[PDB]
Amino acid sequence: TYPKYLLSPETIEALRKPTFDVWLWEPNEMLSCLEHMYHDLGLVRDFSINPVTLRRWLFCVHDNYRNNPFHNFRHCFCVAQMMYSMVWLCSLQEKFSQTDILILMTAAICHDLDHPGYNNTYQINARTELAVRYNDISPLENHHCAVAFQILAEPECNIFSNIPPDGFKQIRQGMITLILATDMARHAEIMDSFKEKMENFDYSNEEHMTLLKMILIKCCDISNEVRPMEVAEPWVDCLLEEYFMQSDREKSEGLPVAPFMDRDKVTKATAQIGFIKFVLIPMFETVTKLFPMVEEIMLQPLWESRDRYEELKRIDDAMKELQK
């Protein structure tokens, strides 16, 4: 027997796949997983990351995620673990430099840092200190990003301490671009840009590759439904918990309420059907043009999830045919 934070060989192997059960593990075990990713991706080797600083940095990242129902440390773990899965699934180390892999992973981990559990529309409408600070420009994502680099600026947490300044600047710019790209209000703009590049994709074109990295981090961020139904499903309850908290607050503060956060309108099936059909499937279809193996491993579960939720909605609707 070994202290939980000693990962088993079985767990290490399972960690490479999108079927990994994100719910089984406590934070200390999740931190060890993330640690293992940096070593296993060769990032510790190639960026001379102090192994103790890596751990201190992950602990500090954990400390700066809030205990929200959804936008919490377990979410950043999911996003990073899906990114790690996609590196193996899509053979990303053939296409991307080690600096690009470092940017993808570190941005995945950092992308929702210190999230308050109320979205940008709330920040903007309530004129919060964050909205005022960032002039209504992706306030949350600007904040996640600032926090990321505030953490990295503390020497005991600086995993980049042994990278030259030019390397740091290159990584910094990449991470900012990616975390900013996680603002869903930009989803159609980013998808349109990507598809435009996808007309004639060029792996040696830097602009093409920046858009590919933004699509990968976006894929991983919104990827919960790619996972086995038993892993995916509790995430929806968590999300609706945050949505309903926000809309309750908006009501009692006299602010606009989004219909997709309305307790009397929204169900799991209504939340997921449109999202899978019109956001997730189309994005993964376009990625599958570059990476055909994504169809079987990620698009198949989405088709299955779509169909299950359509069945669910049909029974939810019937149940309400009994209620007035």
Ligand X SMILES: CC(C)Cn1c(=O)n(C)c(=O)c2nc[nH]c21
Please, which residue, 132 or 185, has the CB nearer to ligand X?
A: 185
From residue 244 to residue 273, the character string flagging contacts with ligand X as x (rule: CB under 6 A) and all else as - is ----------------x----------xx-
Site stretch for ligand 5GP (CB under 6 A), options 148-156, 158-166, 269-277, 289-297: 269-277
DSSP string, 257-323: --GGG-TTT--HHHHHHHHIIIIIHHHHHHHHHH-TTHIIIIIHHHHHHHHHHHHHHHHHHHHHTT-
For 313, residues 6+ apart whose C-beta sits below 8 A from its C-beta are: 267, 269, 270, 273
136 binds, among Mg ion, ligand 5GP, a copy of itself, none (CB under 5 to 8 A by kind): a copy of itself
Q: Give, as ranges, the residues between 169 and 198 that touch ligand 5GP (CB under 6 A).
A: 182, 184
Pick the closer one to a copy of itself by CB: 149 or 260. 149
Looking at this protein, which amino acid is placed at residue 232?
A: A
243 in a labelled binding site: yes
CB nearer to Mg ion: give 241 or 304. Answer: 241
Task: Mark the segment that binds ligand 5GP (CB under 6 A) among 6-14, 153-161, 191-199, 216-224.
Answer: 216-224
Query: Which position has the token pair 């699934």?
Result: 89
Q: Which of 36, 179, 37 is nearest to 114 (CA)?
A: 179
CB 40 within 8 A of CB 16: no
CB nearer to Mn ion: give 49 or 246. 246
The answer to the question of residue 275 lying near ligand X (CB under 6 A) is yes
Give yes or no for residue 127 binding a copy of itself (CB under 8 A).
yes
The active-site residue out of 36, 39, 62, 71 is: 71
Q: Is 143 a catalytic residue?
A: no
Residue 302 identity (one-letter amino acid):
L
CB 86 to a copy of itself: min, Å:
25
H helix runs in the chain, sequence order: 9-14, 27-40, 43-47, 51-63, 73-89, 92-95, 98-110, 120-125, 129-133, 139-153, 165-180, 187-198, 206-221, 229-253, 268-275, 281-290, 294, 300-320
Could you list the active site residues? 71
Binding region for 3',5'-cyclic GMP? 71-75, 112, 221, 243, 271-272
Binding footprint of Mn ion on the chain (CB under 5 A): 112, 221
